[PDB]
């Protein structure tokens, strides 16, 4: 019964805890307060997904770099634009585990890029994290049909 927004936000926080200073961008603090996040970033389910998503990022390293750079340098309304990417992945055929993980990994990679670049304006980090979290709510129906995030990792991946 953890929502996709909770699990993505926990993954992003964990990813921050293990990159650079291990410090959290103010935006991730805000998102935790407002969601509100009830899942620990050190929860085993989060550590396990974090490894799967890092594997997907590494395997598709350049494609993730390129797609994110094209996205962020072309958008005029960052949060809205996350929604467009989301719908084109998940309403173009049935959702699948792979597509769900590909999306989550892309989001976590975007958040990592934004938070590691000290020059990134606050508003770009803020609207991107809000955008990814809001768009990701669209996975809740399908993942519930799979018994939730915890079932999928423990039993299917």
């Amino acid at each position: 019964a953890y929502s996709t927004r909770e699990i993505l936000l926990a993954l992003c926080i964990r990813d921050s805890r293990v990159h650079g200073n291990g410090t959290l961008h103010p935006v991730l603090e805000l998102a935790a307060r407002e969601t509100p996040l009830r899942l620990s970033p050190e929860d085993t389910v989060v550590l396990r997904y974090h490894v799967l998503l890092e594997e997907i990022i590494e395997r598709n390293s350049e494609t993730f770099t390129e797609t994110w750079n094209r996205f962020i340098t072309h958008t005029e309304h960052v949060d809205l634009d996350f929604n467009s990417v989301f719908l084109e992945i998940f309403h173009r055929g049935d959702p699948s585990l792979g597509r769900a993980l590909a999306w989550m990994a892309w989001c976590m990679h975007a958040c990592r890029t934004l938070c590691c670049n000290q020059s990134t304006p606050y508003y770009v980090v803020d609207l991107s994290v809000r955008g990814m979290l809001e768009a990701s709510e669209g996975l809740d129906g399908w993942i519930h049909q799979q018994g939730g995030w915890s079932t999928l990792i423990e039993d299917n991946i």
Binding site: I56, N60, T67, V85, R92, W106
Partner: peptide, 22 residues
Amino acid sequence: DMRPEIWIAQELRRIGDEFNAY
């Protein structure tokens, strides 16, 4: 204008489908 976002989704659908055999 919305062209970057359609390419991005093409790539992630592809990546997700590759994973489905993984």
